[PDB]
Amino acid sequence: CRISFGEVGSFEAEVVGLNWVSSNTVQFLLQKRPDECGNRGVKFEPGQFMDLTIPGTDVSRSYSPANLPNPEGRLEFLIRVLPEGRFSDYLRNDARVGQVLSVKGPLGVFGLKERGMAPRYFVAGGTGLAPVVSMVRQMQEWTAPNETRIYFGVNTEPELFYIDELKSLERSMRNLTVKACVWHPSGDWEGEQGSPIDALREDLESSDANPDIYLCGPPGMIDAACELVRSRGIPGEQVFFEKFLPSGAA
Ligand SMILES: Cc1cc2c(cc1C)N(C[C@H](O)[C@H](O)[C@H](O)COP(=O)(O)OP(=O)(O)OC[C@H]1O[C@@H](n3cnc4c(N)ncnc43)[C@H](O)[C@@H]1O)c1[nH]c(=O)[nH]c(=O)c1N2
């Protein structure tokens, strides 16, 4: 018998998916038990989030997964993997489609909180915004048909994408605003638009980000964005920041 002595809030997922959507990005779909397979019953949650190890080891980390508004069970994560790295090699050498991985983390992902009807900006750094984009659409389809602003950024871009996806959101409706990050990096960029988040610093000084500010990505957008706010003055009420994946956030 395997090890078992204290497991409250864990689920079982069968590795069947695991497709490479981008150069250093992959969408893993696991379904093997009630939670993210067939008995979890989804309906669009605040970016569901848990804690799991590649093969269940115990030295990985927590990742906010997303299924979609549908009572079934399908978790899809956007992990930034780098060929020859440390997780991408182990992902294909220990996370193939012939195994079982249990996810443990009856928790949520706090980063973007809409006040109902107000211009809010959510800047996600990277592709791990999968949960971000999921929760984003939920607000618009919920009762947030107002001005919903979203900030998307990463590296050079040739390795990333989803620009048209959010762009369509802006083209769709609800006073949407899409931010164009990246300048000329390559996948190691702390921030968004070429610069030390200086642009956002001025935005506070101007007007368009304060009431509700959502930050998703590296801890930098948290350190710098939080600094500009305290340095300038831009007093916010529904402002929130989250630390996910490497560089890509303010
Ligand atoms: C609530 C919450 C929510 C999340 C997360 C945590 C928490 C608490 N995380 C973090 C989570 O731990 C996640 O699984 C890891 O940070 C992913 O790192 P790997 O272990 O996959 O590293 P991995 O070993 O794969 O390391 C990736 C490496 O790839 C290289 N690289 C990155 N981008 C590149 C590019 N464009 N071009 C070339 N090389 C590049 C870099 O050198 C980088 O260090 C996350 N993580 C995540 O990725 N997405 C998410 O959505 C979330 N969400």
Curated annotation (Swiss-Prot):
GO terms for molecular function: 2 iron, 2 sulfur cluster binding; metal ion binding; methane monooxygenase [NAD(P)H] activity. GO terms for biological process: one-carbon metabolic process. Binds 1 [2Fe-2S] cluster. It catalyses: methane + NADH + O2 + H(+) = methanol + NAD(+) + H2O; methane + NADPH + O2 + H(+) = methanol + NADP(+) + H2O. Residues 8-113 form the FAD-binding FR-type domain. Its EC number is 1.14.13.25. Keywords: 2Fe-2S, Electron transport, FAD, Flavoprotein, Iron, Iron-sulfur, Metal-binding, Monooxygenase, NADP, One-carbon metabolism, Oxidoreductase, Transport. Its cofactor is [2Fe-2S] cluster. FAD binds at residues 123-137. The soluble methane monooxygenase (sMMO) consists of four components A/MMOH (composed of alpha/MmoX, beta/MmoY and gamma/MmoZ), B/MMOB (MmoB), C/MMOR (MmoC) and D/MMOD (MmoD). Responsible for the initial oxygenation of methane to methanol in methanotrophs. It also catalyzes the monohydroxylation of a variety of unactivated alkenes, alicyclic, aromatic and heterocyclic compounds. The component C is the iron-sulfur flavoprotein of sMMO. This is Methane monooxygenase component C. It comes from Methylococcus capsulatus (strain ATCC 33009 / NCIMB 11132 / Bath). The chain holds residues 99 to 348 of 348 of the full protein.
